């Protein structure tokens, strides 16, 4: 339940079983047990892989405690949803999403020479409608420059490429000046913070647009799934769902000795308890210990 | 919420807003005279200034007890609020039972009466399957895994295309 | 019996967290 690197990730989380294992470990430490030494080993690849597989154990049970704001009109449900995903990323050891995906860009193209190669390497992280708009600008300046546009910063091909990529990004709706002013910085705080307040209006626009796109896809998927399901007769629905339940339950009763399967069956028993305790008192809810 | 909060007996509500419960505070500089009045039973006390500041010393920290999860219950509530939208248009279906009598049987063409009885059987199919609300849970369990795999992103749980394109705008238009 | 707890009920159920933990426990020693 605790492996002494799991419990360091679970300190800053507010999830239920994570705080339960944290409280059990802290309670065992209060009865005179000793803190294990933190391993000063497992070099950068193993460290980043273990970070990836330790933050996911904070992320994914914390995703299931975030209610999707489906069918909710307005700004506040989508802002609540994106704020809860932000706080979940902060609890899991992520940075800001801007800083984290810019770190992904800097890690991917630490080795590139030409700008079409940074477009071939950050292909997976930018939208293809933006990648195509940058590729056509790159071919446009490549026709006139008669050289591969290198990733330099001061070459005339790069300057006349960036002066057009700023134009296409202004066309997309991304204010490139305020984003560059925030991520570059300024001296006087009363003129750096007046553009940080514009970067944060763009940033709030950006993450509510992304969370609303996720909510719209889940709405469309649930409506498509229901309207495929409402066309069946009831006996087909009952036998299909009973077969799916029985197969997924046999998959967990097949593998024994694993921790996930016995947690799966404990959770099935907990759903049966929830049904039983609602059955014994339906106008008050499930029986919570108080 | 935070560890130190700074509210209580200052710019507080002086009266209730609806007539379902009556509440008045006769606040002096030091303490307050509150009489809460709700129907049959009404209560009254003198709440200190050092009590409304001492109330947020411990936190309640409310949390939802769900059958499976809160995400699953949000998806199931959406499925239920869509099945209500389909039920509302199975609610405006015309009563075919007012045309079952034998004066409607023998006046009608045989194939049109067979089509009419098939339409009645079809409505019973649609109404029997739109009110199978014990299927919505296993329908919501089909939206959960793909969404929850999209939130196990290697970048961030909250990352999307707009923030990643804006960060590529910052990254590409900086000095390499 | 009934009336289980409060922290035992706040936990989301069919999240993975133990397939991720199983993949960590079968992967991180195998890559060390």
């Amino acid at each position: 339940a605790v492996s002494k690197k799991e419990v360091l990730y679970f300190l800053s989380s507010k999830d239920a079983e994570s705080s339960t294992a944290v409280k059990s470990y802290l309670k065992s430490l209060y009865a005179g047990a000793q803190v294990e030494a933190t391993e000063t080993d497992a070099s950068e690849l193993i460290a980043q892989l273990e970070k990836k597989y330790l933050s996911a154990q904070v992320v994914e049970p914390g995703v299931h405690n975030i209610a999707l704001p489906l069918g909710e009109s307005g700004s506040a449900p989508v802002k609540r949803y994106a704020a809860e995903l932000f706080n979940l990323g902060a609890q899991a050891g992520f940075e800001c999403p801007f800083i984290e995906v810019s770190k992904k860009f800097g890690q991917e193209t630490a080795t590139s020479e030409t700008v079409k190669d940074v477009l071939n390497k950050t292909k997976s992280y930018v939208s293809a409608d933006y990648n195509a708009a940058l590729n056509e600008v790159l071919s446009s300046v490549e026709a006139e420059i008669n050289g591969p546009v290198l990733f330099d910063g001061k070459t005339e091909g790069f300057k006349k490429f960036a002066a057009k990529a700023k134009a296409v990004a202004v066309s997309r709706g991304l204010p490139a000046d305020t984003i560059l002013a925030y991520c570059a910085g300024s001296a006087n705080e009363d003129a750096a913070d007046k553009v940080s307040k514009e970067f944060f209006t763009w940033f709030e626009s950006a993450y509510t647009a992304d969370a609303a796109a996720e909510v719209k896809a889940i709405e469309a998927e649930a409506a498509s799934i229901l309207d495929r399901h409402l066309a069946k007769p009831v006996a087909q629905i009952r036998k299909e769902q009973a077969s799916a339940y029985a197969s997924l339950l046999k998959r967990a009763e097949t593998a024994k000795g694993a921790k996930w399967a016995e947690k799966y069956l404990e959770d099935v028993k907990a759903v049966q308890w929830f049904d039983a305790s609602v059955a014994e008192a339906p106008a008050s809810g499930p029986k919570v210990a108080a | 919420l935070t560890t130190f909060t700074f509210s209580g007996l200052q710019d507080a509500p002086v009266a209730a807003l609806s007539g379902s419960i009556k509440l008045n505070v006769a606040a002096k500089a030091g303490k307050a005279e509150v009489t809460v009045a709700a129907g049959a039973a009404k209560a009254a006390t003198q709440v200190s200034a050092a009590a409304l500041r001492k109330l947020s010393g411990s936190k309640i920290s409310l949390a939802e007890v769900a059958r499976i999860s809160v995400l699953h219950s949000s998806i199931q509530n959406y499925l239920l609020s869509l099945s209500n939208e389909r039920y509302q248009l199975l609610s405006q279906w015309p009563d075919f039972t007012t045309m079952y009598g034998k004066d409607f049987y023998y006046r009608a063409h045989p194939e049109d009466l067979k089509k009419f009885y098939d339409a009645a059987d079809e409505y019973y199919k649609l109404y029997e399957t739109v009110t199978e609300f014990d299927s919505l849970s296993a329908l919501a369990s089909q939206v959960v895994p793909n969404y929850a795999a999209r939130r196990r992103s290697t970048v961030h749980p909250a990352i999307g295309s707009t923030v990643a394109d804006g960060a590529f705008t910052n990254f590409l238009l900086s000095k390499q | 019996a009934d009336a289980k707890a409060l922290d035992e009920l706040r936990k989301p159920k069919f999240s993975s967290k133990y397939l991720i933990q199983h993949v960590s426990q079968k992967l991180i020693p195998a890559v060390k």
Partner: peptide
């Protein structure tokens, strides 16, 4: 009510693939 447990990551950043509108409301009005 239970779902298949998956342990895999999303290495790309993609728009979330909105699904097409079904004709079930139009077919039930028909």
């Amino acid at each position: 009510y239970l779902a298949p447990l998956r342990s895999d990551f999303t290495e790309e950043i993609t728009a979330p693939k909105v699904a097409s509108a079904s004709n079930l409301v139009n077919e039930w009005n028909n």
